[PDB]
Scaffold this active site. Structure first.
Site, PDB file in Angstrom:
ATOM      1  N   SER A   1       0.747  -1.272  -0.244  1.00 50.85           N
ATOM      2  CA  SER A   1       0.086   0.070  -0.012  1.00 50.85           C
ATOM      3  C   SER A   1       0.948   1.324   0.000  1.00 50.85           C
ATOM      4  O   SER A   1       1.801   1.535   0.956  1.00 50.85           O
ATOM      5  CB  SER A   1      -0.909   0.080   1.244  1.00 50.85           C
TER       6      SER A   1
ATOM      7  N   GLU B   1      -1.630  -1.316  -4.231  1.00 50.43           N
ATOM      8  CA  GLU B   1      -2.912  -0.448  -3.660  1.00 50.43           C
ATOM      9  C   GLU B   1      -2.295   1.010  -3.385  1.00 50.43           C
ATOM     10  O   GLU B   1      -1.423   1.161  -2.665  1.00 50.43           O
ATOM     11  CB  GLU B   1      -3.333  -1.068  -2.503  1.00 50.43           C
ATOM     12  N   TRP B   2      -3.085   1.972  -3.931  1.00 49.29           N
ATOM     13  CA  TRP B   2      -2.898   3.198  -3.458  1.00 49.29           C
ATOM     14  C   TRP B   2      -4.113   3.472  -2.491  1.00 49.29           C
ATOM     15  O   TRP B   2      -5.223   3.287  -2.715  1.00 49.29           O
ATOM     16  CB  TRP B   2      -3.171   4.293  -4.631  1.00 49.29           C
ATOM     17  N   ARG B   3      -3.711   3.893  -1.170  1.00 50.20           N
ATOM     18  CA  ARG B   3      -4.520   4.032  -0.151  1.00 50.20           C
ATOM     19  C   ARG B   3      -4.887   5.646  -0.014  1.00 50.20           C
ATOM     20  O   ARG B   3      -4.152   6.477   0.316  1.00 50.20           O
ATOM     21  CB  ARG B   3      -3.881   3.811   1.204  1.00 50.20           C
TER      22      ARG B   3
ATOM     23  N   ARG C   1     -10.106   3.739   2.017  1.00 51.80           N
ATOM     24  CA  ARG C   1     -10.617   3.066   3.220  1.00 51.80           C
ATOM     25  C   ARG C   1     -11.107   4.069   3.857  1.00 51.80           C
ATOM     26  O   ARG C   1     -10.483   5.010   4.682  1.00 51.80           O
ATOM     27  CB  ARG C   1      -9.436   2.244   3.781  1.00 51.80           C
TER      28      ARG C   1
ATOM     29  N   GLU D   1     -13.833   1.734   8.794  1.00 52.56           N
ATOM     30  CA  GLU D   1     -13.400   0.498   8.464  1.00 52.56           C
ATOM     31  C   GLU D   1     -11.754   0.619   8.819  1.00 52.56           C
ATOM     32  O   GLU D   1     -11.069  -0.205   8.140  1.00 52.56           O
ATOM     33  CB  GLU D   1     -13.837  -0.071   7.192  1.00 52.56           C
TER      34      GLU D   1
ATOM     35  N   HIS E   1     -13.955  -4.762   6.877  1.00 51.29           N
ATOM     36  CA  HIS E   1     -13.030  -4.623   7.882  1.00 51.29           C
ATOM     37  C   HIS E   1     -13.534  -4.535   9.331  1.00 51.29           C
ATOM     38  O   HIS E   1     -14.224  -3.579   9.497  1.00 51.29           O
ATOM     39  CB  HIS E   1     -12.015  -3.567   7.769  1.00 51.29           C
TER      40      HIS E   1
ATOM     41  N   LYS F   1     -13.198  -9.802   0.167  1.00 56.99           N
ATOM     42  CA  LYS F   1     -12.033  -9.511   0.962  1.00 56.99           C
ATOM     43  C   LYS F   1     -12.951  -9.091   2.550  1.00 56.99           C
ATOM     44  O   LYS F   1     -13.635  -8.391   2.860  1.00 56.99           O
ATOM     45  CB  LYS F   1     -11.254  -8.376   0.642  1.00 56.99           C
TER      46      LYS F   1
ATOM     47  N   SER G   1       0.458  -0.582   6.347  1.00 61.53           N
ATOM     48  CA  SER G   1      -0.950   0.090   6.190  1.00 61.53           C
ATOM     49  C   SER G   1      -2.087  -0.608   6.964  1.00 61.53           C
ATOM     50  O   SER G   1      -3.182  -0.066   7.030  1.00 61.53           O
ATOM     51  CB  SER G   1      -1.223   0.007   4.818  1.00 61.53           C
TER      52      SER G   1
ATOM     53  N   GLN H   1       0.883  -6.540   9.469  1.00 59.01           N
ATOM     54  CA  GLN H   1       1.760  -6.522   8.134  1.00 59.01           C
ATOM     55  C   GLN H   1       3.178  -6.580   8.501  1.00 59.01           C
ATOM     56  O   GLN H   1       3.655  -5.868   9.336  1.00 59.01           O
ATOM     57  CB  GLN H   1       1.610  -5.575   7.051  1.00 59.01           C
TER      58      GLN H   1
HETATM   59  C1  LIG Z   1      -7.597  -4.502   1.942  1.00 55.20           C
HETATM   60  C2  LIG Z   1      -7.017  -3.845   3.002  1.00 55.20           C
HETATM   61  O1  LIG Z   1      -7.875  -3.180   4.158  1.00 55.20           O
HETATM   62  C3  LIG Z   1      -6.269  -4.915   3.966  1.00 55.20           C
HETATM   63  C4  LIG Z   1      -5.320  -4.190   5.129  1.00 55.20           C
HETATM   64  C5  LIG Z   1      -4.602  -5.333   5.994  1.00 55.20           C
HETATM   65  O2  LIG Z   1      -5.430  -5.797   6.618  1.00 55.20           O
HETATM   66  O3  LIG Z   1      -3.521  -5.761   5.572  1.00 55.20           O
HETATM   67  C6  LIG Z   1      -4.458  -3.029   4.431  1.00 55.20           C
HETATM   68  C7  LIG Z   1      -5.268  -2.231   3.704  1.00 55.20           C
HETATM   69  O4  LIG Z   1      -4.341  -1.096   3.155  1.00 55.20           O
HETATM   70  C8  LIG Z   1      -6.150  -2.623   2.523  1.00 55.20           C
HETATM   71  O5  LIG Z   1      -6.935  -1.785   2.111  1.00 55.20           O
END
Ligand SMILES: *C[C@@]1(O)C[C@@H](C(=O)O)C[C@@H](O)[C@@H]1O
Length: 252
Positions: free
Chosen positions: A21, A46-48, A82, A86, A143, A170, A232, A236
């Site tokens: 991201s 991914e561009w946040r 996002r 969430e 999320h 997702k 992000s 991670q």
């Molecule tokens: C898809 C997403 O919400 C998953 C997040 C994660 O839990 O790793 C990272 C986010 O940047 C991403 O949009």
């Protein structure tokens, strides 16, 4: 299974795809980040967008998108706003959220957009159809930063995303116990075994959930997020370490 092919990357076969991201507050920082990111190895950028401060201006957003695509002409590019609700950085109106996503679609600069399920069924479905009419794929997302629903609830939520036309459902959920990590893996496997129509992306967040970001190939998560310098979302790990683990599991 209906896989998703973007720029010769096949999502839903083989090794889980690595997403990183890009987070920049303004055009200058987006430029700098794009130049750094193109020296990392990963599958999908991914561009946040929610980290971008001039969110009110659709044209400023589109200018930043151009900067990214110019820097990386061949990368699969996922456009994601996002919402704060969430786990994102800011809040905008539903109308402006939809406007930004439609502008991204129209630009031809992006391969995929993220749409949050809980935006509302009718708006989501209309926007999915708009994306598809313009050859853009949709990662439909949810999320929960507080807790982990039951496995049965998570399966039904992913199935609803399928039903609304998601190309890739997702879900990310927050474990309150180690058991909740197993719950997330159990839901993921249930999709693989019984609802294998679309690739799904799943994760249990935070340090306790890290194993879920590594075990996508065996239980059925089609992609996983790594960090270039800053995460992000919680849990991670460094993208090169993520890549190392995925390769070891794929070749075990
Ligand atoms: C898809 C997403 O919400 C998953 C997040 C994660 O839990 O790793 C990272 C986010 O940047 C991403 O949009």
């Amino acid at each position: 299974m209906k896989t998703v092919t973007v720029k010769n990357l096949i999502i839903g076969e083989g090794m889980p795809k690595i997403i990183v991201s890009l987070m920049g507050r303004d055009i200058n920082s987006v430029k700098a980040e794009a130049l750094a990111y193109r020296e990392a190895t990963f599958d999908i950028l991914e561009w946040r967008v929610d980290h971008f401060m001039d969110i009110a201006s659709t044209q400023s957003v589109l200018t930043a998108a151009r900067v990214i695509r110019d820097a990386m002409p061949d990368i699969p590019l996922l456009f994601t706003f996002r919402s704060a609700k969430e786990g994102g950085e800011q809040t905008i109106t539903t109308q402006h959220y939809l406007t930004l996503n439609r502008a991204a679609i129209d630009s031809g600069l992006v391969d995929m957009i993220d749409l949050e399920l809980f935006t509302g069924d009718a708006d989501v479905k209309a926007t999915v159809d708009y994306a598809h009419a313009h050859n853009v794929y949709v990662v439909m997302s949810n999320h929960d930063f507080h807790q982990t629903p039951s496995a049965e609830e998570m399966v039904l939520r992913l199935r609803k995303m399928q039903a609304l036309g998601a190309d890739i459902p997702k879900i990310a959920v927050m474990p309150q116990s180690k058991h909740d990590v197993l719950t997330l893996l159990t839901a993921t496997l249930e999709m693989q075994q019984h609802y294998a129509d679309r690739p799904v992306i799943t994760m249990s967040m935070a340090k306790e959930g890290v194993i879920s970001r590594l075990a996508g190939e065996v239980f059925g998560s089609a992609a996983t997020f790594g960090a270039v310098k800053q995460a992000s979302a919680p849990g991670q790990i460094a993208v090169n370490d993520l890549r190392s683990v995925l390769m070891i599991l794929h070749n075990a």
